[PDB]
Design a protein around this nucleic acid. Sequence first.
RNA 1: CCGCCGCGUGGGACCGCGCAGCGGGCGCGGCGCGCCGCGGCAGCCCCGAGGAGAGCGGGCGGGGGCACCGGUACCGGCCG
Length: 165
Amino acid sequence: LSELEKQVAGTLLKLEDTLYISSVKEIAVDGDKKAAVVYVPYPMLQSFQKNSEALILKLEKNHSGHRFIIVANRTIMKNAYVFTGKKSIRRPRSRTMTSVYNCILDDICYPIHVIGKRTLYPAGSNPRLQVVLPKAVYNEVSERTKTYSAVYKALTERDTEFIFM
RNA sequence: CCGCCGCGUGGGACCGCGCAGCGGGCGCGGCGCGCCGCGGCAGCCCCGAGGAGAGCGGGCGGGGGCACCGGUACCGGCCG
């Protein structure tokens, strides 16, 4: 129940000539441009991912003022086992904190595959992570690395920086 | 203050175990044993160790066992 969903859904209906989204979150960057995330339901992520690049481009052209990102919504449980007193319940490994963050990272920029991750530990600076991307693509995603870092920090408290190799 | 391998509280990093879905209504204050929509859940597999094992292809080798088999030489005998 927000204004943005209404016009983005209007655009959605204006694309084809079935699939619905859960919610939307926008976050600003250092520049006046913001980035909007779409919390897609988990099962329909792959169906949205067949040609997500086209959808994001058409949405950007339809409604400017901020970039459109599409991601799934995953839950996190905070206990490996559960002691009901009678039987012990195992938490599946897919619901851990670490798996969700990595999947989020891969989803933020699915069309361009990540070729490596590295975390650096400076002497005093808060430890930070730098990823590695192909040189085949750069100017395609060079202009939108700051937004990627900002959204990663927003969703995950962990920070990051982007490079190419 | 000092003879405790036992008792209680907390911490919970390190050290090792946790196979058998959950949520709600019938359902009594609670806990059980059952009946009900799956109609509430992202329902239900870390990765795959310059650890180990199995598999395919390649050649490599006085590696092993069985049968068969040639060559002079030592020895003995015989013709001259």
